[PDB]
C-alpha cells in the first residue's frame, strides 16, 4: 500500500475509527500501534477514490459526538445531587479526548475543514459539549455551583479540583472563538455569580455593623476582603480577577461611604494611626 | 558538522557529529539510543573499520559528502559475544521504475 | 530525546525528536495515545509510507532543522525525479 | 532564509519531471494536484496547463480546491489570456458527457448536475457567460428529460443560476422565456405541496429588468424577492438580492432605502466572504453606483478603484468583470473630476474597458454601448479643454462614432422608446452642442426629453440633466432664452427635490441663469443668483467632507432580517 | 465648460 | 530552471555523465545567450561553472574557464557590470591554475 487515493469503503474504517475515538473520548486505552495505524486510516478517507470521503467522516463524526455528549448529559441526569462532580469527572476526560481527537483528526482538519459553517473537530466537540452538555445544564448547574463558593464563604470545604475544574470549563469551551473568548463565561456563570456575591456582600454585611461598631468593622472589612482575595485565586478565571473586587467593595463600601467619611472626621482629630492605613488602602 | 546514518541491519540512526570529534562520542551516541556497549559496535565506512583513535574527519566524513541533506551511511555490527557479525546493511527499497520518456517504444 | 519512526518495509528511522516535529502529523502522532510509550524512544508505525521514501523524510527533517532561521544562502533540497511523485504524496501526510 | 517545505519542494521536482509522470499527476490528491497546476502556472508554463485544464475531468478536480479558488480565477484567466480557449473548450466538453450519458440512471446523471453546477458556477464568476449558458442548458437538459421533485428542484435552481449568465451576457429577450421557464417549473413544484425559495431568481429578474430600464416593475420584482428571504439562504443569495434590490431603489429615486439595503450588502460579503473576494468587489461596484447617484461623488471613485482592485487581483487582465469595473471607474473619475477636467486616469480606464471587452466579445454585443458611452463623454469633455482644433475636431469625430455605436446596440437591443437609448440620445445632443450643430443638437435633446420624462417621470435624476443639458444649449448656444429659463428652472427644482441644495449639478444650472439674466436683464435676479451661489459653495465645503464609505458601513450595523424588515415595512 | 455631466 | 535543477543532481557523479551534462549546459545556454536570454542563460553556465569546479582534474579548468568566458559575455548583454569584473578575476584565477 500507498499514500495514493484508493477506492475504500466507509463502511469498514469508520468501524476501525469508532472504536479508537470511543476509545480516546473517555480516556481508555488504546493501543499506540492502533493509534499511529488510524491515522492511515483518515488520510485513506479524506483522499479516497474516486469522491474524498471527507465530508461523509465529518458528519458521521458529529453524529458520534451527539451520540456521545448525549448519552454523557442523560448519565449525569441519573446522577442526582453529584451532578458537578460527576460534570467534572466527564469534563475532565472529554477535553482531553478532544484534543486527542483533534490530534487525530489533523488531516480532516487541515485539508476539508479549513479549505471547505465548517468547525474544526477539536473545536466541534468543544462547541457540542456546550450545546449538548452544559446548555441543557445551565441553569442546574449553576444553581450548586454558587452554593458551594457561598458555601465556602459559609466555613466549608468545597472540592478545589471539582469547582475550579467546572468553572473554568466554561472558558474552555470558548477556546477556539476569538471574537468573543470570554463571553460565554461572562453571559452564564460570571454575571449570576457577581449579582450572588452582591447579595451576599450586602445583606450579610449590613450584619457587621449590627453588633460591631466601626473599629471592629475595619478589621473586618479587610477580613472579608483578602479572604475573597484568596478564593478569587481558587476558583475564579484571571479575566474576572479585578472586576469581582471591585464589585465586592462596591456593594459593602461605596453604598457605606457616608458612614466611613463622616466617622472620617474623628480618626484625623483623634490621630487613631491603627486605622490610618485602613483609609489608605480603601 | 558531519551528518551521519548508523546503519546496522534495518536501523537507521539519523544523527549529527562534529567534523573534529572522533568515533568514541560516536559509539557514546549510539550508546544512548540502542543502549549497547562501544566494544560491542565496530563501524563500518564502506566495507572499513574505524579505529576508536581516529577522528570522523581524518577517516573520510567530511561536511562536504555528508551534508544535511545527504547524509554518509556508515555501518554498524554488534557482537553477541561470538567474533561479532558481517556488515548486513539492507537498502531500503526500489523506487518504481520511471522508464526514460524519450527511449523509443 | 528520539523517535522511532517504522516505515512499512519495516525499516526503522532513528531521528531526534525535536527532527519529528518538524512535521504537524508526526506531532499529532506522538501526542495522546501515542506518547504513552514507556520504552524511552516512541515507535512510530508508518505502514503507508515505504522506506525508500521515509528516509528522505527524515533526510528533509535533518536538513530544515539544521538550515532553520540561516543567515547564508541556503540550497534546494535534492530530490530525485523517480522518488518526487511518492515523497510529495509523504510530504503531505506528514504536513512538513 | 527560511527552507522550503518538503511539499513544496517535491511541488517543484514533481512539475520539473512532469512529462513524466503527466499521468501520475492525476493520481494525486485534489489539493496536490491544484498546487502542481498552479505551479505549471507560476513557473510560465501555460502551455501545458491550458492542455490540462481544457480536459474536464483534470478541471472538475481542481474545481474542488475551494480555499484556493481565488488563485485558480486568476490561472484560468492568464490561460483565457494565454490564447488558449480553455472555457469554450471545457463547456463543448461537458455538452458531449451530457449527449452521451442522456440515457443513464440518476444516480450518475446528477453527478455531473453537480459537476455540471460548480463548473457553471465557475465560468459565471469568471464572467464567461456566453461559455457557462452552454453547461447550465446541458444541465438544465439534463432535468429535462425526466420529471420528478429531484430533478425538478435542480431544473429550478438551473434556470435561476442560467438567467444570471443570460443577464451579463446582455441577452435579455432568452431571459424573459428563461424566468418563465423557471416559473413554470415552480408551479409544477407547488402543485405536488412543495415550495421552493423565489428569493433568487426574482433577484435575478430584478438584474433583467433593470439592465431593460423597467425600473418601477425591477422595483415590484424585487420587493417580491426581498419578501422572500428567510435564515437558511445561503449568503450568496442574500447579497445579491440585496444588491439588486438597492439598485432598483435607487433608480427608483428612493435614496433612503437603498443606503441601509447596500451597506448590509457589503457588509454581509466583507464579513462572509473577505475583502478580496469577487463577490464583495460586486458589492462594491454596486455600492459605488450607489454613491454615485446619491450625489455623493468623490467618495464613490474611492468605491470602484476598491472594486476594480480585487476584481484585478482576483481576475487578470481581458477579462469582463474587470472591465466593467473599468468603465465604472472611468465613468465616476469622469464625473468626480467633471468640473476640474483632468481627464487622465478616467480615459486611462475607459480604454482599457474597450480594449478588453472588444478583444474577449463580439462587435456587436451590448457592453460596448456601456463601454464606448464612457470613452466618448471622456473625450469629448478632454477636446474641449485642448485648444487645437485640428485635435479637437478628430476627439469630437471619434466620440461621434462612439455615440452612434452606441446608439446603435441600444436601439438593436432595446428598441428606441427605451430609457438606455434615451441617455444616448441625450449624450449625443451634449456632443452636437459641443461640435457647433445647433438644430441637431436640439432635435436630439427634445427626443431625449420626449423619451426620458415618460419612462421616468416628470421629476426624475435622468430627465432633470437631460432638461440641465437642454437649458444649457438654449442658453449658451442657441440663445433661446424664454425656454431655457423655465428648463433651468425645472431642472433646479427637481434637482432640489431629489437631491437637495448640496446637488452638484445645481452649479452649472445657476452659472446659466446668471448669464441669462445678464444678457437679457432684471440684475436684482444676477445678484440673488450670485448670493444662492455662494451659499451653495459654503453648503458644498461642508458636503464635500470626504470619508471612507468603508467605515460608513462600518462593522455589524444591522441584522440581515432588520434590514429586509425595514426595507419592507416601508412599502 | 457651459453643460452638466453626460448621463 | 530545469537544467539548473536537473543538473545539481549529478555533482557526484562519474565524468562521462558530467561532461556530457557540460556539453548539454553549453548548447543549451549559447543558445540563449544568441536568443537574447541573457538572464535565462547565466542561470544554465553558473550550474555548469558549479560543476566544472567541483573535481581536482586536468580538463575541468579548461570546461570552467570556457564557462567563465560566456558568464561574462551574458553579464555584459544583461548590464550586470558588477559582476563582470569578480567573473573576470576567477576565470584569470582558473587560468593561473
Known sequence: TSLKPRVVDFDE????????????????????????????????????????????????????????????????LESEEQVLVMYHRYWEEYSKGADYMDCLYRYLNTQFIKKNPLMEIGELALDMWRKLMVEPLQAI?????????????????????????????????????????????????????????????????????????????????????????????????????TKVIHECQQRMVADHLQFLHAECHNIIRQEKKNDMANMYVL | DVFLMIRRHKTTIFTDAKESSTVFELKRIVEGILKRPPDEQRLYKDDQLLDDGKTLGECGFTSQTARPQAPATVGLAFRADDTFEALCIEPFSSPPELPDVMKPQ | MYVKLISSDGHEFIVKREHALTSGTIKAMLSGPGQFAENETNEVNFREIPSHVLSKVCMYFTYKVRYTNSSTEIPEFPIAPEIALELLMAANFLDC | WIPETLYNTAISAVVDNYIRSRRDIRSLPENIQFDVYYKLYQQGRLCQLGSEFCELEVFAKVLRALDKRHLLHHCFQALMDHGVKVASVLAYSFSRRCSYIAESDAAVKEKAIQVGFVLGGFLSDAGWYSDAEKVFLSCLQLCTLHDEMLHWFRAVECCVRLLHVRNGNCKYHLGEETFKLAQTYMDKLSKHGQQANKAALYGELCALLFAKSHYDEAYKWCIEAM?????????????????????????????????????????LARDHFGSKHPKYSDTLLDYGFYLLNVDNICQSVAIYQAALDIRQSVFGGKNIHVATAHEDLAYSSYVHQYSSGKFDNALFHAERAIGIITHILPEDHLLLASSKRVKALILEEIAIDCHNKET????????????????????????????????????????????????????????????????????????????????????????????????????????????????????????????????????????????????????????????????????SPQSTEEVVQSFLISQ | LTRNKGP
Open chain 1, 13 to 76: 474504517t469508520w468501524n476501525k475509527l469508532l472504536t479508537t475515538i470511543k476509545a480516546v473520548v473517555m480516556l481508555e486505552y488504546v493501543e499506540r500501534a492502533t493509534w499511529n495505524d488510524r491515522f492511515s486510516d483518515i488520510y485513506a478517507l479524506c483522499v479516497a477514490y474516486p469522491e474524498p470521503l471527507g465530508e461523509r467522516l465529518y458528519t458521521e463524526t458529529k453524529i458520534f459526538l451527539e451520540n456521545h455528549v448525549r448519552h454523557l448529559h442523560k448519565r449525569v
Open chain 4, 227 to 267: 419578501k422572500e428571504i428567510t435564515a437558511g439562504l445561503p449568503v450568496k443569495v442574500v447579497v445579491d438580492v440585496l444588491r439588486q434590490a438597492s439598485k432598483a431603489c435607487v433608480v427608483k429615486r428612493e435614496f433612503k432605502k437603498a443606503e441601509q439595503l447596500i451597506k448590509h450588502a457589503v457588509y
Open chain 4, 392 to 555: 479637437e475636431q478628430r476627439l469630437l469625430q471619434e466620440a461621434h462614432d462612439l455615440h452612434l455605436s452606441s446608439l446603435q446596440l441600444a436601439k438593436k437591443a432595446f428598441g428606441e422608446f427605451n430609457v438606455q437609448t434615451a441617455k444616448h440620445y441625450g449624450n449625443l445632443g451634449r456632443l452636437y452642442q459641443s461640435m457647433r450643430k445647433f438644430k441637431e443638437a436640439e432635435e436630439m435633446h427634445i427626443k431625449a426629453i420626449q423619451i426620458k420624462e415618460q419612462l421616468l417621470g416628470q421629476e426624475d435624476y435622468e430627465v432633470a440633466l437631460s432638461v440641465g443639458h437642454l437649458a444649457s444649449l438654449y442658453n449658451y448656444d442657441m440663445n433661446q432664452y424664454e425656454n431655457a429659463e423655465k428648463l433651468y428652472l425645472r431642472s433646479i427644482a427637481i434637482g432640489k427635490k431629489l437631491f437637495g441644495e448640496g446637488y452638484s449639478g445645481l452649479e452649472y444650472d445657476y452659472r446659466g441663469l446668471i448669464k441669462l439674466y445678464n444678457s437679457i436683464g432684471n440684475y436684482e435676479k444676477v445678484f440673488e443668483y450670485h448670493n444662492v451661489l455662494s451659499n451653495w459653495n459654503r453648503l458644498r465645503d461642508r458636503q464635500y467632507s470626504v470619508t471612507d464609505a468603508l467605515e460608513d458601513v462600518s462593522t
Open chain 1, 141 to 241: 448547574l449553576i444553581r450548586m455551583l454558587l452554593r458551594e463558593i457561598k458555601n465556602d464563604r459559609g466555613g466549608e470545604d468545597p472540592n478545589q479540583k471539582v469547582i475550579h475544574g467546572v468553572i473554568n470549563s466554561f472558558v474552555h469551551v470558548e477556546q477556539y472563538k476569538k471574537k468573543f473568548p470570554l463571553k460565554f463565561y461572562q453571559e452564564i456563570f460570571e454575571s449570576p455569580f457577581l449579582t450572588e456575591t452582591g447579595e451576599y456582600y450586602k445583606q450579610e454585611a449590613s450584619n457587621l455593623l449590627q453588633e460591631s461598631n466601626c473599629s471592629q468593622y475595619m478589621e473586618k472589612v479587610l477580613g472579608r476582603l483578602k479572604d475573597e482575595e484568596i478564593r478569587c485565586r481558587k476558583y475564579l478565571h484571571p479575566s474576572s480577577y
